[PDB]
Design a protein around this nucleic acid. Structure first.
Ligand SMILES: Nc1nc2c(ncn2[C@H]2C[C@H](O)[C@@H](COP(=O)(O)OP(=O)(O)OP(=O)(O)O)O2)c(=O)[nH]1
Ligand SMILES: [Mg+2]
Ligand code: NA
Ligand code: NA
Ligand code: NA
Length: 325
DNA sequence: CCGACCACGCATCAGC
DNA sequence: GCTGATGCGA
DNA sequence: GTCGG
């Protein structure tokens, strides 16, 4: 908000590189810059000043001067004025449709919300669901609905086996008053790094949420990851709640912290920490934190009793979810 | 100044 | 089937 | 796009 104008500009650009130019690096570069800029406590007044920041090279400084000078950016005005791109970008907003398929479709003549439904026969199951709920998914979730959802999930879980521990991470755990979707970390004593003493541990919980009619659709589903859709039950004659994206990740309970850390994010906060990690000599991931060998091979996983333990290894002052972004 | 740039589960496809 | 890579969304 | 080997 302080540097909002800027970070929005950088954001839109980043999206154009990921969705059109299909260049994640330029995508990240732009994100990283917007990320460090959003953290900058001063109201920027030039590209010279901005560049001093890591992640802001000359190019971005140049655009910052233009924007600050004209209240806009020609490059962004052009892209916005080009139908092809605007259709591609548009298409990627459907769950299941990334840069690649979106482009193909604009090539195959499909480029409007109308075209898509008229060619459902071109979409796979997932992309199909992303289309059906397209409108619903564009919506952010009120923190109160989140709660009503967290409540339902934790109950049904207990109803399957009280050894299960379910935790809502993502932007929720970070204290957001709204969320894009719902991220659920799961754990059970019967599954650790040493062994899996039960079959269908994730399945028992998924099916339970469906039997109860909370889970409506399944984007994809393995033995540790579930991507689907759900909806809060609504009261008679009351417009129903938008369907929402929901993920449930089953982690070995002895790794609960690395995984909760990962799943709490943000994604950007994560990449940073992981970057810092490597700089301290470590390699982090939802599972463990291992020291790196000369060859580049990770050593045995180091013991962790808390998220802070992970920050300690990297020599970072603990940060409650609330300060991660 | 060229090249690397977090980490991974699930779906699918090419080569075998 | 498997490996390795693409694609997708984390 | 950056910045570091
Ligand atoms: N390390 C790493 N973690 C990621 C990446 N993308 C997402 N994540 C983690 C942190 C997230 O906070 C969780 C899933 O996150 P989301 O995309 O739902 O982010 P988040 O809930 O923070 O935003 P939201 O309010 O739901 O729109 O996976 C990534 O590229 N790298
Ligand atoms: Mg989320
Ligand atoms: Na800089
Ligand atoms: Na999409
Ligand atoms: Na999600």
């Amino acid at each position: 908000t302080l540097n909002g104008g800027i970070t929005d500009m950088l954001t839109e650009l980043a999206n154009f590189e990921k969705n059109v130019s299909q260049a994640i690096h330029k995508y990240n570069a732009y994100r990283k810059a917007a990320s460090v800029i959003a953290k900058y406590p001063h109201k920027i007044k030039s590209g010279a000043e901005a560049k001093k920041l890591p992640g802001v090279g000359t190019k971005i400084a140049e655009k910052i001067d233009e924007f600050l000078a004209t209240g806009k950016l020609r490059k962004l005005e052009k892209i916005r004025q080009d139908d092809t791109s605007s259709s591609i970008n548009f298409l990627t907003r459907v769950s299941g449709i990334g840069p690649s398929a979106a482009r193909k479709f604009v090539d195959e003549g499909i480029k409007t919300l109308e075209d898509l439904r008229k060619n459902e026969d071109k979409l796979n199951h997932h992309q199909r669901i992303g289309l059906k709920y397209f409108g619903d998914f564009e919506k952010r979730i009120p923190r109160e609905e989140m709660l009503q959802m967290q409540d339902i999930v934790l109950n049904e879980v207990k109803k399957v086996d009280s050894e299960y521990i379910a935790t809502v991470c993502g932007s929720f755990r970070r204290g957001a008053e709204s969320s894009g979707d719902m991220d659920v970390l799961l754990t059970h004593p019967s599954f650790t790094s040493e062994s899996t003493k039960q079959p269908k541990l994730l399945h028992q919980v998924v099916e339970q949420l469906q039997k109860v009619h909370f889970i409506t659709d399944t984007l994809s589903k393995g033995e540790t990851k579930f991507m689907g859709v759900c909806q809060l039950p609504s009261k008679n004659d009351e417009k129903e709640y938008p369907h929402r994206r929901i993920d449930i990740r089953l982690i070995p309970k002895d790794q609960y912290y690395c995984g909760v850390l990962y799943f709490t994010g943000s994604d950007i906060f994560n990449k940073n920490m992981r970057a810092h990690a490597l700089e301290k000599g470590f390699t982090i991931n939802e599972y463990t934190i291992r020291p790196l060998g000369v060859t580049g091979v990770a050593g045995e996983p180091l013991p962790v009793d808390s998220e802070k333990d992970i920050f300690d290894y990297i020599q970072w002052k603990y940060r409650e979810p609330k300060d991660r972004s």
